[model samples]
Structures are given as structure tokens and as C-alpha cells.
Target: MSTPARRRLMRDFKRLQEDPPVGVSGAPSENNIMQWNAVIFGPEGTPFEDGTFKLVIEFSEEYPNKPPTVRFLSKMFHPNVYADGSICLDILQNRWSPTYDVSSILTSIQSLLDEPNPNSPANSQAAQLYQENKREYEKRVSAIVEQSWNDS
Candidate 1:
């Protein structure tokens, strides 16, 4: 991380700490600010609801000019999420803008819990099942739900 980008990241980090998004918690580890860890509580009423998902964010030297590559460390079940835990979110791609902060990104992720884009999916089979057989999809998602979600 260069000086200017590091400064900017620190600013964003402070802002995130001050106004954290709903259902999400994030902070830089003690030694590094460029790599931050986040945990997002799944949205209510969805298969992902009540689950606490962990993601690791890697910030580049370009900072805001380049979007961070975020990958889930937790076992997550979603059509747009890969088996390796990489998520397929638009904002992480061409939809990113400087105006979009970490709070907004986390908010988008929380919303993605309920509303997934199966059209361009990372998990093709999950996408198929999600669209074709809702019950099976729920069952499949429920498996991970049981594995990862804890209501208490």
C-alpha cells in the first residue's frame, strides 16, 4: 500500500467504524489495514437469514481506483457465490465507484442475501436448482444453513 492510497483507506476505515452497516461487522487486523475482515449477518426471512458470513477483503495499491477482491472464508450457499467462497457481486466489478464506500458495499451484500442474481451465476447448478426447483433449492441451501447458521 502506497502512502496516498493508505491514507484514503484509513479514512474509509474510520468512516466504517463510525457508521457501520446493518448486519455487518468489519475491521482491519492489528498489523495491517490493507486487509480487512468482515462478518455479515444474513438478512431476515431468507435462507441466508440469521447466518453470520465471514469475508476477507484485499485492498490494492490503487485503492479506490481499483476495487478490492473480496472472498468469503465461511461456508456460504448462494448462486452467485463460488464453492471457493468468491462472490459474484456487480459492485466488485464494473459497478464500482468512488462514491461507494465500505458501508454501501456491505449493505449491498446484506441485500444480496435475499435477492440473488441467478442470471449470471457463479454456481451454475445452484442457479438451475434455484430457478427450476424452489424446494430443492431451499433444501440445498438449507443444508448449508444448518451447517453455518445458528439461530441462538
Candidate 2:
């Protein structure tokens, strides 16, 4: 018998496949309904443009009550992304609501690529660069983008 988490995940997967959002895609791991792999194509008109970012989403039995753990799988250079790939987004943490779903989470992450919250940065150097030297920030982000291509 499927657990609530597994059932919900199946529904989420079906929705994602039937009417996927632009620039993001994900599916549960073949062996684990509790684990998912996702990809996000960086939004246009941002320093991260053209980059292909990957992510891991881990769900728990307490999901919907507790938020899933999300992290970047591909190295990223951004104020909101830690050196260890953890993120500093409010929705993923303190502001999370059971109302949020997988699609919404991925969309929010995609938006964050261009609109990083430097004030609560996970990468201090990237935050400082973003605030004090956009050119340098963009340069570093471009390099990360190139690196992402190599990863693919």
C-alpha cells in the first residue's frame, strides 16, 4: 500500500509531466519515491541565463507538514546558494507552507536565479560581490554557467 507521501508524489509527478512549467523539470528517483531529481534552465535576462542547473529534492513522511529538503546538485555561484549547495530562500525554510507543491517550489527556485536575496546570502562573498560589484558577480556567474555546460 502507498503511503500518503508516495501517493502525493505520484500525483505531483503526473501533474509535472502533463503540464510542466517552463524552464523546470523533475521526476522521482526510480528506487525512491522520497527522492527526486530536478533541472532548471536559468531564466533569461539574468546573469544566470543559459545555465543549466540541477537539484535534488528529498521528501519525508512528514511532507506537506514539513518541507522537503532541496539543494543544488550542480555547483552554482550565487548569493543565495551556499558553497555546499544549500539555499537561503525563505519559502524553503521559515516561510514554507503546506499549500506549496513541487511545481511551485521549482518555479520559485527558478525565479531566484535572477532575483537572489543578497541580504540573507548563503555565500557571503557572492553577496558582497553582488552588492558592490555587479560586473564581477556577472563574470563569476558566467563562469559557473560555462561550468554547468561542461557538467552536462
Candidate 3:
């Protein structure tokens, strides 16, 4: 019998395919129902505009009781993204709730591009730049946005 986590993931996958959220799309990996590859387009008017961000999502049997692991695949220059692509988001950490699903995850990540939590940044330098130098921060992010095209 399929596990509860697997069954729930299948449902989420079907819903995502049927009605994908704006600026976000993804699917479970061919061989791993618990793993997904996703993409989130930069929101309009944000410094991340036009960027194509890739991410990997990994779910475990403890899902719903625990949050999945999510990481950026495309290059990123954001306060919340670590040099290694790991993200530092509240929902992914101690604040996680089972009510959050695939669509919500992508949407939250999309929103983070424009509104970062500098207090707990994964990248201290990026956080400092974002707070101390808006122009420089935008310029740096723009470079990564341009680079995303090639990487994706």
C-alpha cells in the first residue's frame, strides 16, 4: 500500500499540473515520487524580475508533521539564499505547519524575492548589502537574474 506521504504527494502533483500558480511550476521526479523539481519566475517590478529560478524539493515520510527540504538550483543572489543554495525561510524551519503544500511553498518563495527577512539571512553579505546599499543590492541581484537565463 502507498504511504500517506506518497498519496498526498500524488494529489499535490495532480493539482499543480491542473492549476499551476502564476510564476511557478513543478513536477515530481520521474523515479522519485517524493522529490520534485520546480521553477519560479521572478515577480514583476521586483529586482528579481525576468529571472527563472529552479528549485528541488524533497519530502519524507514524516511530511505534514515536518517540512520538506527545498533548495535553489539556479544561481541566486538573495538575503535568504545561502552560497550553497539552501534557503533560510521561516516556514521551512521552526514555523512550519502541515497546512502548507507545494503551491504555497512556491508562492512563498516567490514572495521572498521582493520581501526578505534580513534578521535571519542565510547570506550575511547579501543581507548587509540589501540593508545598507539598495542600489548595489539590486545591481547584484540583476546580475544573477541575467545569469539565470543561461543556467536554466
Ranking by TM-score: 2, 3, 1
For candidate 3, give the lDDT of residue 102.
82
Write down the TM-score of every candidate: 0.87, 0.91, 0.90
For model 3 the TM-score comes to: 0.90
Residue lDDT tens for model 3, 1-152: 86898988888888778887889888888888777899988798887778788999978988767888898877778878888988889888899998887889999999888788877867788878866898997787778888876744
Model 1 whole-model lDDT (C-alpha atoms): 0.80
**lDDT of each residue in 51-75, candidate 1, tens digit only:** 5778888888798888787888888
lDDT of each: 0.80, 0.82, 0.84
Q: In candidate 1, how many clashes are counted? A: 0
How are the candidates ranked when ordered by lDDT, highest leading?
A: 3, 2, 1
Q: Which candidate, 1 or 3, has the higher lDDT?
A: 3
Which has the higher TM-score value, candidate number 1 or candidate number 3? 3
